[model samples]
Target: DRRALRIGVNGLPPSLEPINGISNTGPRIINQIFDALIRRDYFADGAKGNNIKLVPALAESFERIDDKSIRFKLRQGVKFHNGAEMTAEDVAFTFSSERLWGDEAIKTVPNGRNFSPNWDEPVVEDKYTVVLRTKTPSYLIEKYLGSWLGPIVPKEYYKSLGAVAFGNKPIGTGPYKFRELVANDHVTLEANDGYWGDKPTASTITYQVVAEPATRVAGLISGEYDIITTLTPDDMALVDGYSDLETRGTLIENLHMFTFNMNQPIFQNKTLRRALALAVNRPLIVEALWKNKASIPNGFNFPHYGATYDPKRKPMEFNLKEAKRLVKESGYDGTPITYHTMGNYYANAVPALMMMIEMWKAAGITVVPKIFAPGTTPKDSDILIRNWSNGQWLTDGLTTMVSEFGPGRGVQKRWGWKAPAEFNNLCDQVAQLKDGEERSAAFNRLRDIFEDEAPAVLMYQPYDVYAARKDVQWSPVSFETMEFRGNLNFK
Candidate 1:
């Protein structure tokens, strides 16, 4: 019997399909079994922060064939878990209308349309060459291909198995194969011996769902588990106290914020929104609540944006006096606004809301925060606190900002938001501009309108921690997810 590498997660998402699920942590599971045309070079990305680089994976190389298309030379001899050789037909069906772009396609997952909104379809130029064309000019096309969003699936295998059977027992062309999977409990993955790239060090990996944070830590310390995820900052010290343990993490590309429903009469006023945004001090929250581990985002962009990252365009402001004055100036009559949250589903969620309540009280406003039930929407509430993430594999201005806020997207669909025409027009042009002066101008104008509206509360960028036994030589630097195929072995 081969020894298994045990990994404990908070909970598992329902779907294991490559381009499915809303959880940012889905990468930890699907990434091991799936291979995209391009994949992030984690070694070159180093041990932290955003500065990611891309490398060819399923594709030997890619070239921009036109302003709206890219020609990829698919790598030969790569084999799927089910023993099917990857070909142009598989690549074409992976992005075909039936599976991706058509009305009947599975848009249920946030990543389905949210991942590559502009992609049209792929043309099988030849047996090994595939041309991926977008509806419009898209600069982030390669990044999308490198991410979990564009995992190439086997056409004949999926057709034979169907959606229900396929999702239950998924197969891919990566370094792992599904050995056993029980919903919301555990997933057992065995190494794919015919893997095209690096051989997996561990013979078997078991990702078990451990709901309690304290229990996860206890499991690791007792040697029952090798690693644990969703670790809290308070428990960091507890894990650190053990000499045989080490904690490693990074500031993931997630932005924790509060979204408002304009339909609420109290939130209809622009002055009220500005007052709410100004009252909270985010840096203090980061220090006191997060131990300064996470950072306040510079507007909506992260450092991974490269030249687009602006240190000056910040949205956080702590002005109690101004907030009080504005609250008084607006027609607000000291009515308590109802706020909804997802409970302990997020780390430090409740305490963070409590701290925010005190801050809002100082500004002459009353807030009542409530934990939401399953399938809760913000239709009848004044505010909803949520966290959203850019792609851990790749990120850009349009994907980060417009992914949620764009028309017919998540925020607009949820909150009934009507965006400015200028903002929509800018996104259309910026989607085509490839990292230059004009593109920079578009981003500046975008921030001008976005922050001026103060549509939502921009809090700190949350950091994720994973504690591991010192004997297990692995670190969770790949955007809050662990990779077992490289540098992951027992000391």
Candidate 2:
């Protein structure tokens, strides 16, 4: 039997329930055990200028019939983990909101909001034929299908067992199958012999929940774990010292920033928000915390999208005098502004929050630092230090920006920001244009509106670091999946 591979992770998934609030931890395991209709090739080395590309997975081929409809040709002979053949009905069921939302599945399916806007529904014409209908034309729909939103499952199996029972013993069309999930300890997966794709090398893959950073490093050195994730820049030296282990770091599509609670009476003033945003030194924060290993975002969107990322746009400059002037102009009363953040949620989280508070203080604005544990949010949080990434497949900055900032979406709707129809209409216009000069022009107008509104401050883009045993050969991908099943092997 091949030696069982153990991976030490910083967080444990709250639940294995898919189609719901599944975060990075859940996808790390689910990506191994399930297959998507379309898939992204993470095997390419980014440092070598390899452009990230999407490829066919469960679907043999897909074509856009018109602006509102797309058709998929499913691959035949694909078998689920239970040895049952997959069909177009499964594909349709996977994308159906009626089947996966409300009391039928999880109470709040946040990911469902992403599709509810433009997606009409998925229709099945035959056993291996499926068509996805959208409310409008979208260039990134194929990318979404090839990633998180498109993982295929057995329709009959899911409905019969229901979400909770099916989550306990999930089935998919992938290289690995769910073996066992020992809550708060580890989720284990066994290699699927009947998988249609390349066979996974390891017989068993285990995601060990080791929340402590120091303990996670110790486990890797002591042969208790074969891999560890999100190693801090400072911790890389410790792993380098160990001859048995090595570290890998790459810039991912995650953005760390301060999202304002627009519902707060004090923060309702746009001038105050702009004053605080302009007072901060983003470069110094990136250097001090990330040790210059990260990239600073110039605008609301990531730089990956060529024209969508405005080259002329500049990041907020650190000007204390200007910030102070704006604060005075806004007539800010003496209100205790609370900035909320997790103590151990991410590397340098506390330090970054403290630094930001100091920056605001220099501009004569009082911002109090409030530290909380992971998964806890205070009702009185004025500002939140949170990080968000574009969904693994779509990988478009507009997708996340529009999702979080659009009318009745994310913080705007949840906390009561009352996003303007102008901004929402601009996003709609941007979506209507094809990927060219026309689309790029629309993106600039959207960015202009966002900057003026100052809903959130765009901060640095951090690199995700991973450590693996010297005997193990694996490369970390930009996606949160941390895929190793078919890629990792013994050197």
Candidate 3:
């Protein structure tokens, strides 16, 4: 008989509302209880590790109507976890101005633009059809619609309960329904018997909140958890000794980098930015901090993007002398460099930040490190050690590019920094074209500007490392999403 699958995670979600929060643990839980319009097959192109394909999930099919509009044929007979049948109205309302553009504008803008920069509103054509009209040509309409941005929510249910109440008990057309959410404890979910997609093998799935890595390992060993995520390289040795537990590591599209606040007088200088990049050694950091478990990304794009990634490009070499010279040339004299980072946001974050401070100090740069808790954004900082992933597995590097340089929504926007007009224009041109030679040409130009300006330091791509019991028949994909509903089965 099938039993409950108990999984342990390092953190609990602050909000169950998918679009409103920044907690990494939220998505893992959200994926189980919510369904997006489209889903990516993270292992589509296994050998080349390039071609991740998007498959239809909620939407049966989609087509481009014009340069500024697209149409989606919604699947019929789909029911939400609440037993209400899904239609174009639910999809339209989910992407409407009130739901997406109102209270959650900050979070919605970036996620919406990931699909289209000129996204205006969704038009309901009929019961089983919906049209999304954009103000500009969207080359990756399908890609965006398939992304996490396209999760269709129950319109009536959401409005009836409002944000807080709905977030506590949300309704979706996913394969699972929310059973309960106990703060700092666990988010319990039960399989939706009326799910349209593949039926879940396990009747109950519980995400236990085990913040400490050692505790998580202990829980897994004690059979309290069938699977545990975010295991560090140092913890791998512990799992290796357990014949009943095994380690699974796959290099995903995630990138960990340090972002500079351009508004700061010190960081405004390109020489200082480039100098900072040259001070740290990637290979050494990988070996010391990550135990050689991660891959050093030469540029923003990872191997998962396939042909779109610039393999020939090289990262800045480590040279303390040159960094010092550049710092001196930039006329910076002991201006305290403040770096804000989260303590438990990522594995080895504090240790890595300490190592970076030491490296920068060796290059004659003054460093001040400020630690913050997870989901807290530090303001008025000179630098931020932030991590990001091109969660949408596609050849279009526009998402990551815009994340750095786009207007209004880029990470640099927080620091009063904007990309050069030339760079922005290039991105605009490329975003209109599908993935091909023309788009590739525009991407090259865009990359040229990024390399020259040094807006952010390109760091290593961290591996999605997890420890799972031998009895659990499952493994995560390159997207770094822990999907276990339909994918896992107990032995």
CA-lDDT, candidates in order: 0.76, 0.74, 0.73
* Window of ten residues with lowest summed lDDT in model 1: 384-393
lDDT of 3 by residue, 1-491 (tens): 56898889977776777665324577777887788888866556453232467778888998877876778898899999888999998888877777775436435333433343566788887899998876667766666666556667798998797655777898888877899989889899998888888887888889898878889989999988988988778788889898989998777666777777787777675888888888987887889978898888666656555446667776656788888999889997886777776774666667777888888888888877777676776666535334333343344576576644665655556765556888877766776776677777677677777767777777677777789988888867666567664468778
In candidate 2, residue 147 scores what lDDT?
A: 56
Best by TM-score: 1
Q: Is candidate 1 or candidate 2 better by lDDT?
A: 1
Instruction: For each candidate, give its TM-score against the true structure.
Output: 0.94, 0.92, 0.91
State the TM-score for model 1: 0.94
The digit string of per-residue lDDT tens for model 2 on 274-306 reads: 888888898889889887988887677565564
Q: Regarding TM-score, does 1 or 2 come out ahead?
A: 1
> Which portions of model 3 miss their true places by more than 4 Å?
45-51, 102-116, 319-321, 372-378, 381-395, 410-412
Comparing 2 and 3 on TM-score, the stronger one: 2
Q: Of models 1 and 3, which has the larger TM-score?
A: 1
In candidate 1, which residue ranges exceed 4 Å CA deviation?
A: 1-3, 45-49, 107-111, 312-315, 374-393
Instruction: Per model, state how many residue pairs clash.
Output: 0, 1, 0
Off by more than 4 A, model 2: 44-50, 101-110, 115-117, 373-376, 380-393, 418-420
